[PDB]
Amino acid sequence: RFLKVKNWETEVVLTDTLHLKSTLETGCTEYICMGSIMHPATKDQLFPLAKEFIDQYYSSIKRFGSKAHMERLEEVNKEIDTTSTYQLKDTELIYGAKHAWRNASRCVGRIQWSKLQVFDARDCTTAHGMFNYICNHVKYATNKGNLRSAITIFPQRTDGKHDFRVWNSQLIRYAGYKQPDGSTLGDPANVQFTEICIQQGWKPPRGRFDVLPLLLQANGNDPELFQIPPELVLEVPIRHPKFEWFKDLGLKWYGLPAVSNMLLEIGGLEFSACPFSGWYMGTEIGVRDYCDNSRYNILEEVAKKMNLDMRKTSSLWKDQALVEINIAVLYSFQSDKVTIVDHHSATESFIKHMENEYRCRGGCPADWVWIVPPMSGSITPVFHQEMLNYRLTPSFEYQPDPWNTHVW
Amino acid sequence: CPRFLKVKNWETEVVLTDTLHLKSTLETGCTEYICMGSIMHPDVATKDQLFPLAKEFIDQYYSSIKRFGSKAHMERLEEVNKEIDTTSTYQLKDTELIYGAKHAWRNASRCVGRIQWSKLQVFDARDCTTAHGMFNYICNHVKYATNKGNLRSAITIFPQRTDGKHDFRVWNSQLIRYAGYKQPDGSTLGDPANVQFTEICIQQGWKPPRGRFDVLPLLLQANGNDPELFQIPPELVLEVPIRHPKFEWFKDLGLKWYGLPAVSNMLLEIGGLEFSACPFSGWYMGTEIGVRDYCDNSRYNILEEVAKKMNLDMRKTSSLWKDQALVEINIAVLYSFQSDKVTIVDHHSATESFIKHMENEYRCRGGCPADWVWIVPPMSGSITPVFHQEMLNYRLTPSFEYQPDPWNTHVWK
Numbered sequence: 001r002f003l004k005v006k007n008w009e010t011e012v013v014l015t016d017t018l019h020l021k022s023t024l025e026t027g028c029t030e031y032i033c034m035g036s037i038m039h040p041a042t043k044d045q046l047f048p049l050a051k052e053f054i055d056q057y058y059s060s061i062k063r064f065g066s067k068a069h070m071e072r073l074e075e076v077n078k079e080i081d082t083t084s085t086y087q088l089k090d091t092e093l094i095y096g097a098k099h100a101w102r103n104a105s106r107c108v109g110r111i112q113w114s115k116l117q118v119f120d121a122r123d124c125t126t127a128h129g130m131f132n133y134i135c136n137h138v139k140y141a142t143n144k145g146n147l148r149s150a151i152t153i154f155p156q157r158t159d160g161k162h163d164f165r166v167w168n169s170q171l172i173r174y175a176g177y178k179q180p181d182g183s184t185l186g187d188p189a190n191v192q193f194t195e196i197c198i199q200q201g202w203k204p205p206r207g208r209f210d211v212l213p214l215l216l217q218a219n220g221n222d223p224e225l226f227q228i229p230p231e232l233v234l235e236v237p238i239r240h241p242k243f244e245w246f247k248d249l250g251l252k253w254y255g256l257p258a259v260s261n262m263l264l265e266i267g268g269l270e271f272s273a274c275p276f277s278g279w280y281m282g283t284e285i286g287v288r289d290y291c292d293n294s295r296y297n298i299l300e301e302v303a304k305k306m307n308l309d310m311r312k313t314s315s316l317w318k319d320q321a322l323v324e325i326n327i328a329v330l331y332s333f334q335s336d337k338v339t340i341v342d343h344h345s346a347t348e349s350f351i352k353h354m355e356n357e358y359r360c361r362g363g364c365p366a367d368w369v370w371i372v373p374p375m376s377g378s379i380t381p382v383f384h385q386e387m388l389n390y391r392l393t394p395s396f397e398y399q400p401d402p403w404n405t406h407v408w
Numbered sequence: 409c410p411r412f413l414k415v416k417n418w419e420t421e422v423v424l425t426d427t428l429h430l431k432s433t434l435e436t437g438c439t440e441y442i443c444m445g446s447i448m449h450p451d452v453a454t455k456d457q458l459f460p461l462a463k464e465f466i467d468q469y470y471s472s473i474k475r476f477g478s479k480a481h482m483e484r485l486e487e488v489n490k491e492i493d494t495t496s497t498y499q500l501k502d503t504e505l506i507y508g509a510k511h512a513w514r515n516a517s518r519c520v521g522r523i524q525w526s527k528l529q530v531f532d533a534r535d536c537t538t539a540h541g542m543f544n545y546i547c548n549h550v551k552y553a554t555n556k557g558n559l560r561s562a563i564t565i566f567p568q569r570t571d572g573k574h575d576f577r578v579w580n581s582q583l584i585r586y587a588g589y590k591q592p593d594g595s596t597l598g599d600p601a602n603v604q605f606t607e608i609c610i611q612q613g614w615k616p617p618r619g620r621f622d623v624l625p626l627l628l629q630a631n632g633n634d635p636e637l638f639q640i641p642p643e644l645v646l647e648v649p650i651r652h653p654k655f656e657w658f659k660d661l662g663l664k665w666y667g668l669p670a671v672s673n674m675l676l677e678i679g680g681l682e683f684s685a686c687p688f689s690g691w692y693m694g695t696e697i698g699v700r701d702y703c704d705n706s707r708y709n710i711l712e713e714v715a716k717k718m719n720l721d722m723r724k725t726s727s728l729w730k731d732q733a734l735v736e737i738n739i740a741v742l743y744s745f746q747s748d749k750v751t752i753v754d755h756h757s758a759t760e761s762f763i764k765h766m767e768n769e770y771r772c773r774g775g776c777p778a779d780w781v782w783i784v785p786p787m788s789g790s791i792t793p794v795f796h797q798e799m800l801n802y803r804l805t806p807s808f809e810y811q812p813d814p815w816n817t818h819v820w821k
């Protein structure tokens with residue numbers, strides 16, 4: 001059936017047909033919704049998946065059923081026979097990567113989906129090679145502050161025993177350290193990964209914002225450590241435009257968000273190493289990175305410097321401090337001419353994107369739980385936008401952390 | 409379905425196990441291939457439909473009072489079954505009605521206030537026959553629930569549906585709301601959410617003061633008859649003028665709100681019986697007023713005005729002038745209620761209490777259905793514990809349900 005979604009503020013109603021294409025499960029059933037749950041080959045499985053993908057690719061370039069299309073299916077089928085897998089054409093690799101992003105229901109940044117620089121790293125064979133490809137990625141994507149969306153794609157999975165993996169969750173992240181008094185220095189999210197780097201020979205500076213080394217695994221071998229050249233790591237000192245004391249908090253962050261632990265699936269093929277990057281929405285840093293209790297957890301300090309009454313929750317001291325921190329982050333990046341988008345601008349763009357997708361594509365899968373910003377929700381247009389969530393392929397998928405699988 | 413579903417809290421790493429979802433009775437809207445978790449909404453029962461619905465409820469009632477399989481249980485079952493046979497409906501005992509109403513609340517996945525579910529004053533209005541009588545029952549409800557500012561949660565239950573041509577209905581969406589008036593020039597005076605209903609009231613004979621905060625009259629339908637208008641005694645309507653503890657100018661905005669949120673357009677379903685008029689009330693979470701009522705663009709929409717008074721830079725969105733004024737407004741709301749000693753809860757306290765509630769429900773009940781999209785407050789989401797809490801949503805009965813607006817279905821006499 002055609003499904004409709006209403007915006008309760010504008011009363012705009014869109015009609016979804018695209019969902020009829022999905023075949024992957026969402027996790028919900030007729031009786032239980034799991035919308036807030038974080039996460040709910042063989043030759044024989046391989047061909048239909050390949051065919052599906054080739055089909056939509058030749059459909060997208062308006063040459064469905066053409067001679068190129070027929071030969072490609074023929075070529076692919078044959079290749080799956082003789083090798084138990086197949087290799088994507090470059091055009092297919094790029095199409096697939098862009099579409100994985102386009103289909104990412106949790107991403108509010110998808111208006112940019114077709115502007116993705118795709119780096120083909122499928123000829124890589126070693127961790128040193130991965131490091132080279134990653135440096136080039138970081139240098140290209142950072143672009144002196146004028147950030148550019150990019151993805152680097154390493155060889156696909158074969159037997160599962162020879163995976164390429166970036167062990168880092170992002171290319172650039174800060175270390176976190178367990179202190180004898182039980183507190184945590186730096187980013188608590190990374191304490192485990194940090195310990196692993198230390199154990200593998202990394203010499204930690206033991207500061208609050210130590211850029212972690214890269215830990216890179218090629219062809220199933222043990223991972224190897226590398227230091228990203230610092231001149232490639234763009235960082236922003238956080239200051240406030242009114243509170244001159246804010247710089248005294250000693251806060252900073254990195255300009256390039258570059259998620260490195262996801263799995264890219266295209267036409268049945270699995271790319272276990274596909275670091276991709278765009279640019280930040282301010283709340284990612286200002287709200288989550290800085291203010292989550294399990295992260296840098298800075299609210300109380302900021303509230304102190306702001307001299308707020310912190311004896312009662314109903315003074316909303318937390319909320320006030322939250323806004324000021326997010327003002328600072330936006331201001332700091334903007335002042336340093338580093339690309340960043342505020343949650344108001346981003347959500348507007350997403351709404352416009354949704355309309356585009358409904359018009360040109362018949363829908364847009366979207367995860368309201370993720371799309372709505374972690375502050376000021378209902379004063380952003382997405383809060384009021386009904387969304388339908390469903391899984392389309394190619395896609396980005398989660399995968400286990402490599403240190404729970406790897407044998408040394 | 410799997411017997412054990414786990415939910416995780418990503419902040420505390422606490423894992424809970426749900427078994428109560430097995431008792432799910434109705435559809436979510438979701439399927440295995442699509443999730444409708446952000447969709448707002450995703451003639452009478454025959455005898456054979458009614459039988460299993462009633463037994464399900466009666467069993468559940470007698471199980472709750474630890475008399476399952478007892479002589480009184482079996483007898484009650486037999487009496488109900490016989491009553492359905494001879495009349496094609498049945499009447500709930502007072503005990504069952506009370507248990508049912510409390511459980512409809514306990515089961516309301518969208519409600520963050522459910523720690524309170526067992527403290528609910530139930531008013532049995534099933535003897536009501538006229539709209540004047542409905543007015544009497546509603547006044548008594550308002551006065552009891554208001555309690556001079558020390559608010560008490562309550563529900564008043566009017567007669568259940570029979571053939572569908574004799575429904576009792578409160579046409580108001582809440583017992584106390586402010587009128588909205590569309591102007592010839594396209595502007596709106598008062599609350600834009602209430603323009604349609606206000607128009608209906610005026611058509612029915614109501615004379616509008618045409619102010620910004622005019623309490624609407626009650627429009628009350630008994631036994632399927634045309635609805636009738638009544639004015640709530642103003643002394644029964646407790647209100648709070650909004651002021652700010654720092655900004656002396658905030659009072660000059662002339663904002664106020666009423667103390668008692670009392671939703672009156674929902675349907676209560678118990679054991680397959682339908683109570684189409686069942687107004688209930690609790691107390692406010694500050695954000696309901698300060699974020700939604702005041703700052704929704706399609707509501708009072710005051711952000712710009714507050715921002716101007718705050719001398720904020722409003723040329724760029726990235727100044728976060730909106731976020732800044734939004735906090736100040738919510739501070740003002742909480743401060744004004746606490747100052748006038750009218751019960752209210754901030755989103756921090758409410759969400760923390762709900763997490764404790766949910767954990768206790770998981771331990772004593774085997775689950776707690778929760779709608780994350782609704783449970784997470786409309787501001788400062790991630791700095792509340794509910795944002796980090798995985799939830800399972802499903803529909804248990806007894807329950808509160810939406811129903812169509814009465815002016816769309818009413819057969820005018």
Ligand code: HEM
Nearest residue numbers: 101104106107108109112149151276277278279280281396
């Ligand atoms: C270009 C600017 C972009 C912006 C502003 C943006 C914004 C966001 C934000 C705020 C999230 C929520 C993540 C979180 O809260 O932790 C997200 C999720 C996501 N984004 Fe985007 N994004 C951008 C580009 C990209 C690109 C280039 C890709 C891949 C090619 C991508 C793929 C994804 C995926 C797969 C998720 C879901 C993450 C998960 O499930 O953990 N995004 N995006």
Ligand code: HEM
Nearest residue numbers: 513516518519520521524561562688689690691692693808
């Ligand atoms: C006692 C204090 C209470 C608090 C603080 C509270 C809080 C809330 C809030 C903030 C919402 C979201 C509503 C919205 O954003 O529009 C809600 C929804 C809801 N509440 Fe509660 N509530 C309380 C009492 C009650 C009572 C007494 C009942 C019924 C007996 C109830 C049943 C419901 C239902 C059925 C919804 C869903 C609303 C809808 O879908 O339109 N609540 N509650």
Ligand SMILES: COc1ccncc1CCCNCc1ccc2ccc(N)nc2c1
Nearest residue numbers: 038107109257259277278279280281284418
């Ligand atoms: C409940 O949430 C979690 C639980 C466990 N692990 C991780 C998570 C959140 C996962 C974080 N995903 C983080 C991400 C991914 C892609 C992005 C693309 C662009 C951008 N600016 N930011 C992104 C940020």
Ligand SMILES: COc1ccncc1CCCNCc1ccc2ccc(N)nc2c1
Nearest residue numbers: 008448519521669671689690691692693696
């Ligand atoms: C998408 O949202 C809508 C769209 C159309 N109509 C109505 C709505 C929202 C429905 C309003 N629900 C409003 C409500 C219900 C029960 C409550 C109980 C206690 C309390 N403090 N507040 C409540 C507030």
Ligand SMILES: C[C@H](O)[C@H](O)[C@H]1CNc2nc(N)[nH]c(=O)c2N1
Nearest residue numbers: 036037038369370795796797798
């Ligand atoms: C439990 C819940 O699903 C979890 O906290 C989600 C909620 N929504 C989110 N939304 C975004 N953008 N990022 C997140 O990490 C999360 N976390």
Ligand SMILES: C[C@H](O)[C@H](O)[C@H]1CNc2nc(N)[nH]c(=O)c2N1
Nearest residue numbers: 383384385386446447448781782
């Ligand atoms: C489209 C979306 O489902 C809709 O705006 C919902 C979102 N969550 C909500 N949550 C609460 N508490 N109240 C609401 O009215 C809504 N509206």
Ligand SMILES: [Zn+2]
Nearest residue numbers: 028033438443
């Ligand atoms: Zn769902």
